[PDB]
Design a protein around this ligand. Sequence first.
Ligand SMILES: Nc1ncnc2c1ncn2[C@@H]1O[C@H](COP(=O)(O)OP(=O)(O)OP(=O)(O)O)[C@@H](O)[C@H]1O
Ligand SMILES: O=c1ccn([C@@H]2O[C@H](COP(=O)(O)OP(=O)(O)OP(=O)(O)O)[C@@H](O)[C@H]2O)c(=O)[nH]1
Ligand SMILES: [Mg+2]
Ligand SMILES: [Mg+2]
Lengths: 501, 1208
Amino acid sequence: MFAIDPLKHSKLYEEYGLYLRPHAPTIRSIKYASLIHSMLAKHAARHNGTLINPRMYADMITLGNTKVTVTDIVTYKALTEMSTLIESFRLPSGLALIIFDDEKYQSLIPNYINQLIAYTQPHIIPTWQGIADFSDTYLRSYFKRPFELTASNLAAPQKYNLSPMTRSIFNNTGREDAVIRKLYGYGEYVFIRYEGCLITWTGIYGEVTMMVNLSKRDLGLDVGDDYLKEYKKLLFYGVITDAIPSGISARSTIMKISPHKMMNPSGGALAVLSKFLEAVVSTNVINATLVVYAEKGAGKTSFLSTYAEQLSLASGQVVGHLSSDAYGRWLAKNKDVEEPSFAYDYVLSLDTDDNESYYEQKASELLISHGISEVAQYELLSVRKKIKMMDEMNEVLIAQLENADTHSERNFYYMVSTGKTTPRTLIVEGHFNAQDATIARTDTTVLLRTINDTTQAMRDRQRGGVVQLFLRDTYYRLLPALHTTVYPFEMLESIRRWKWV
Amino acid sequence: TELYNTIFSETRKFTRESFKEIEHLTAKLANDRVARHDFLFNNSIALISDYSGEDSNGNQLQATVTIPNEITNPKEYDPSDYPLAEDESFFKQGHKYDYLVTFRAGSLTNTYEPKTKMYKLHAALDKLMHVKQRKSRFADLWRELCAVIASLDVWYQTTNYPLRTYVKLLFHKGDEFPFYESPSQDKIIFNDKSVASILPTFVYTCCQVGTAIMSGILTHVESIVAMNHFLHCAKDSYIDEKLKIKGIGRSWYQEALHNVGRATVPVWSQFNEVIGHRTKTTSEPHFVSSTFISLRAKRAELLYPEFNEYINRALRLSKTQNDVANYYAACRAMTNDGTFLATLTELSLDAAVFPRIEQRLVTRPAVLMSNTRHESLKQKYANGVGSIAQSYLSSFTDEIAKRVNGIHHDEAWLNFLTTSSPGRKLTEIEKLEVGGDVAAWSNSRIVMQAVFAREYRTPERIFKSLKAPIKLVERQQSDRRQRAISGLDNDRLFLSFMPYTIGKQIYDLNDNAAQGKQAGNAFDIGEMLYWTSQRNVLLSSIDVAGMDASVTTNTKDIYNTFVLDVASKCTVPRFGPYYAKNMEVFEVGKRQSQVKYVNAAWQACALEAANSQTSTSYESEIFGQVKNAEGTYPSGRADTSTHHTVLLQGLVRGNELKRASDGKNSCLTTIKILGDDIMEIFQGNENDTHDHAVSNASILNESGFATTAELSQNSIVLLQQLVVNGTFWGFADRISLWTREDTKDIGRLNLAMMELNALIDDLLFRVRRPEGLKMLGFFCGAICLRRFTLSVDNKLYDSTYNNLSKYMTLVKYDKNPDFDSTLMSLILPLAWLFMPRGGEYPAYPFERRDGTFTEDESMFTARGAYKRRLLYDVSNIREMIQQNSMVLDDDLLHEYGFTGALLLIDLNILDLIDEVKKEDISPVKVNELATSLEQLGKLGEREKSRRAASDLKIRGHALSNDIVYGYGLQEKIQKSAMATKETTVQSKRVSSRLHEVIVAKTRDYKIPTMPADALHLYEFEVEDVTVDLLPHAKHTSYSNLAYNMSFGSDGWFAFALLGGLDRSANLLRLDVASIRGNYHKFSYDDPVFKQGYKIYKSDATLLNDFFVAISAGPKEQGILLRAFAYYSLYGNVEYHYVLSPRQLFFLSDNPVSAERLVRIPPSYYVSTQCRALYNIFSYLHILRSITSNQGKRLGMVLHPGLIAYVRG
RNA sequence: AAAAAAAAAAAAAAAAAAAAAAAAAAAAAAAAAAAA
RNA sequence: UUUUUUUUUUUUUUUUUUUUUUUUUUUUUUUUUUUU
RNA sequence: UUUUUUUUUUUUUUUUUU
Ligand SMILES: Nc1ncnc2c1ncn2[C@@H]1O[C@H](COP(=O)(O)OP(=O)(O)OP(=O)(O)O)[C@@H](O)[C@H]1O
Ligand SMILES: O=c1ccn([C@@H]2O[C@H](COP(=O)(O)OP(=O)(O)OP(=O)(O)O)[C@@H](O)[C@H]2O)c(=O)[nH]1
Ligand SMILES: [Mg+2]
Ligand SMILES: [Mg+2]
């Protein structure tokens, strides 16, 4: 007895790769589960949506030890109807409750099942990477089982003992399903259709998997391809499933491409992005602003310019984008001018990569004051000396946030945000959570995550590197993961799901 | 025409000629505006300019009335005072004036085109100037000013004193008042457009200054300095100047307390009792004296020169401690206004709620165990202030993990969710999917959960709550800024419920919190009074300026780590929509992904800490919608009180452990914390305690807090209560008799006089002269809240006027023959203030037949039926005990006019502001909502109760739905629905039902005599035996431990005779409290008790099921059985006196303590309950007549009817 | 959109103290009180 | 010795409402209503 | 050879305080 009724809702389990055996006691059990779902949906909707006595329904369904028979009375009629319907099954033990461990599965569970969870030990099925495992008892009995065809395993079904009504087929041979279907006697069987690809990359610490929301025909890679080739579609759509620090880097080749299920975005990330879009479209709000944090090296500007272009073309209004280090590159030039230019185009003109930052110069002096110039000199130091140097850098990060003065940072973001020629919807990146009291006032702020090992990418920059790595360490030591964690495909999907005009 | 020539004004005794005179003149004031304008602005007042006399300590002071130019001749409206940004989204960032700048009234013109930004701004400034200044607690502001002026006149018997000249020079602009307030269109309509804009607030300012005069804080001379200082502060912006120099005009007392050198103070014990007095030096230590230079230069450069010369007068001319106490009280009354501080939300939103960053930053702890979304599960600090706090709280994790397990948290959620509050606003589809009446009463937090209770176990609602914003809500408070607190809906509160429950548990394990121990009397400051008496002590009163604006995200992570550790050691399944299961998880060091069994609450705390948004949102009528900057604390959550307490005690105790581990001692003994306010106490040498104080200050600056660090040898401040060397210095200038935060009419005048009594009772042990306060309260009950309107049916106008004018004066108005339902405004007599179910105010002496007067009732007098004793006191009670009568002498009572008050108090005219709250609320719908609401926590408790209630219905007699635990939530939602439909009518509805009962009761109307008022009639006779005093009367002679307990004062003498309070000397409780009332905190007039005792009179076979219908536990079951058994035996006598605990602040609570002062004959003891009853009699009389005794023993007589009532 | 009309109206969390619980009448009985 | 009212107390029963604006009435958001 | 204890219901309004 599953949470979501498979006889009613077949397509959702078809998406997971689970097909129904055609028409034994399992068939009777699954039909009795369908009748129990229908009866519960009748009784619960007759009230506001709450069951009358949820532990009684839970015990009658799960345990089968309770028989309610009345020979007020009107308050128990809903229980007596359920009691006759359970008595007329004659099971030796009651039906169990089955839940998958996936978020997309739990968002579709009806409310009465959620009420019945709290008074019943469910049978929770864990998932590997979003797909429920197939060695479990209930799935092996009810649904038909997959079969994996590879470049070695490929043969006729008569070489095995495969049957149509018990075995389903999943290929990853790279050949087309029509070719394998009409060339190998696989016409009678049924195939699993997946849409994502799961790529295991070679990294320094070991092999690294990667889940990609695109398809294998779209994301055109083959076995032995570089990491920089098709880097941007991977950045837009990929997610590393391993523990940080993962070892993905610019030297990474691949090992195998396997089809896999798509990913589903979280509820909280779509909620925060939808609240931002509600702030964009409304005329009650004057200034709309998003704040996006990332570790120094995650590659956020090359995505957020594309995000701004998507939002601009989809909403029609002009989105202005402030960079991550606009304040440092502005303070490098105007630390001595009494009254500087707070205009928007003058700030965005000084935003290129040739313009050095103020914090990078001060951290370079802080590194050279301890005789550190190389990465091999910095990594060789112990942790406590690094913490000492990071506190010496915190003593100069604190000096620009403490008060609202004409060279401060809170005044800078005030005068840029509330200008006359500034765009309406703005997007501002940050570096640490203390800067949120300084960056202009919002309702939404997120923390972005990409497919990058940030300490690995800073080892490979052609210029500097040591100051970049030291500032990365200071910034990672300054911000925790205390806001919502938002991947790039979540933002692109949140743009797509919002209806316009 | 003149109150100061009356015979009440010089004898202060209600004779028969005086009482009618005062009643007539107060009627003259309360009726029409013409008598008020002639009273306040008579031409007989000689306008004075120079005035000389004593200060608070008899030193001669000379002053001069001086009004600046900017109040009489205001500047024109400068539009640059409230500027805007260039995108015009908000005000200017750095702007000076958050409040009402003084300018000419008619200069504020809106000439712009409508639906434009400048038009919106000038309309909002108009709304600021007219609406946001009227804060009148009782009635019209001119009538409150008249009440204060009249109290001053009848007290001092003369009209020439400076405040009348201040009134005639500020407010006398022509023949009419410059402004009036209107209840219909709620604003202050000006009539002279050339008057200054701030000038309506000076009505309340003059009321507070006169309240300080009648209070005895400052004399007539110091009122000149106070009003000059206040008029100086309103030169540019009246509120900003008071907020700027608030700290500098109060932080001077430590220097004068140093300059008196040596004082003789009493010494307290551990166990709340005075031992003796000693003479300690009062010199501050060497490091404190380095601050006096900076404070002296700062008060020289910011302050006003008259106030500065007064502050230097107070420094130079003090000799004892009490000179400093009196001068501190005077400077409190000179610097505080008492008015609430209010403007538009958008102005004070920057300085109220904007997050700021101070000295150091706070860093992150390393993440040991991590969710698949990289949300942190288990984490730990390496080194820092988080390490310092967790090094103390990691000991406490393990016991709290055991305590959290034994709490069923869904029922705990419901019992917390009991509070009615808005939360969320509905959308349109639910208003059609749910009844429109349900959408009407959907303004409550319990009803909102009852509506959406079908998705309580669904995890999607938590992700759904993040889309909704957090609506801001403003608050006022006197002498502080407009604090803008946040207000959030159900699910934002639900995420912060488990951190509240986890951090709640720390109070049982560790004593250092002032939250669990509050009582309203001297048991609250036993700690401060004990520790200030000790030697080699260092008292540090550390405050954090800007508590919520300092707590950033990283500072909140310290509390997060403690909650996560306790939750990871906890084991609870099924908290909310969450449930215990196995989760894929990441760990540090491991490269792959592990699998651990995460329980429910730790999932809940992880999702709370991971998705933390603070930024509030106010929808302005000026700018559209204003967003707040992120990084504040939300401060509307459930855990908004325990967060600060746990954080601060973790920092302080961890600093103690760190100093111990670094080879240094810890001089700290005991601390108390409520949150923003911390008491610290050190003991040892000067060097060690100064080191430990500076180390705690340094660790607070390491945690990023701007700290206010006042520390001394002989002063402590916590909970707005200040103590200097075993002596409570109250703050009388903090609370205000003349302003309320919200404007509310009086629909029921008992609630007005109860508010008046509760406000006066807080001003007893913090005032210097309570007698003038009693007289001021009498006059603001006299003329301010006296007029009560009426609207009769037009046919029966003259009949009702011919009936009700025998007992009252009915101000007859013109009939309208054109339109029906005419009105007849009446005024109710002054005897109403002295009656139970009436005003309940203490009484002045009345004249009997003999000429002998009654006892002048003090401020410690009881309330309740002991106020009904006053009728028998007006009758000659010793003559009543003489010839064995019980006749009340209705001639004298009708002559004083009490029987009209009793007629009005019985016919319940004042009780009928709405007269009904009807049915057709569809209780089927309420029963369905509370059916779907029971299904959340503890299933099975209430169905049993309904079956027991049906059993008691079917065989015997029914119970009320009020009484049944199963019908409790039905009754809760029903009573929440009754408050959503509220109405207060401006007039009355005396239409033939009220008229028939008035015609029936307008008879001779003798006052009824309940046969149980025979306990009221008894008297005491003065012997010539002077009794001994308590020995602590000698020790509190030098420095009085309160303002009003000075040597020779009646509070001191009552404290001498009755003695101090104690919790262990409770000889009679079960015999005292029942004839007081309730048995064991269950009342006798409790429907629990009443229905149970009606069961107990009948057969007791229905009794166990009665308990099952209530569902009370077995211990309370045995208590209730004892209650019926003890009520059935000698439940005859009960006396019902109400005695406030704040009113009885240092005095004794146990009435047995007055048994050694009254000699009782042994032939009177005829029952098992006489010994408590007689002690109640003697205790109430010794507190009642404390202004008339001179220390002599009493004898008691009793009436034979009382003996027959007690016997029976 | 120019105009007219019924309704839904905005005030969080913790610690502590004090007060409050429809009306009218009929049937049985005692005290107070008027008449005889 | 009979009757008029208050109150300690028992039983039964009715169980239940109106508009009047003294007001110098406020603003925008939405469902519906009629002219243009 | 017997005699004594300190305690959590709800609704609304007010007060002190964070
Ligand atoms: N100087 C004044 N000038 C003009 N109108 C005034 C003035 N003072 C009060 N009022 C207004 O005149 C109205 C007359 O009210 P009215 O005399 O009918 O009953 P009221 O309630 O006794 O008046 P009040 O507001 O003084 O209590 C007041 O409601 C108020 O609106
Ligand atoms: O009604 C309230 C008031 C206050 N609080 C909470 O208690 C704290 C109030 O603490 P205080 O009132 O003692 O000082 P303050 O912070 O308000 O004023 P400044 O020190 O900034 O000068 C605040 O931090 C608030 O979170 C509430 O939760 N509710
Ligand atoms: Mg404080
Ligand atoms: Mg504070």
